[PDB]
């Protein structure tokens, strides 16, 4: 079987969650996926899975044990409010924002800089010219 143990439980009212260190004992196995940790920490601490965040998990040399950090928000909405974006995307709570690469965006920015005004009037002027 696999055991999970929470230690150093700190209550955090003004961010409305609980902090702790997760120790996962997994004999005869590689490790536990974060999703399974989230769902059962939800079961034990008795919160909805979405309010549960788990990260920073490292297995000890030789295997059989891992240690990470766990957060249990008082509500799903509170988790959505305070909790980092990239991790919500990890949990699917947020959708990945599609953006172009930094060089592309900077080129867009500079070329936008060289135009003045909306430019629609320039567009119609050149259209009439040609």
């Amino acid at each position: 079987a696999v055991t999970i143990r929470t230690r150093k439980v700190i209550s955090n009212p003004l961010l409305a969650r609980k902090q702790f260190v997760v120790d996962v004992l997994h004999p005869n196995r590689a490790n536990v996926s974060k999703d399974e940790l989230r769902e059962k920490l939800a079961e034990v601490y008795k919160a909805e899975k979405d309010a549960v965040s788990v990260f920073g998990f490292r297995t000890q040399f030789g295997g059989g044990k891992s240690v990470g950090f766990g957060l249990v928000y008082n509500s799903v909405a509170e988790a959505k409010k305070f909790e980092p974006t990239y991790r919500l995307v990890r949990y699917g709570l947020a959708e990945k924002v599609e953006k172009a690469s930094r060089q592309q965006r900077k080129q867009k920015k500079n070329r936008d800089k060289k135009i003045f005004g909306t430019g629609k009037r320039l567009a119609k002027k050149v259209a009439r010219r040609n």
């Binding site: 079987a1 696999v2 055991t3 143990r5 059962k40 601490y45």
Partner: peptide
């Protein structure tokens, strides 16, 4: 104090 658990 924390809580303890086990599955499978």
């Amino acid at each position: 104090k924390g809580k303890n658990l086990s599955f499978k």
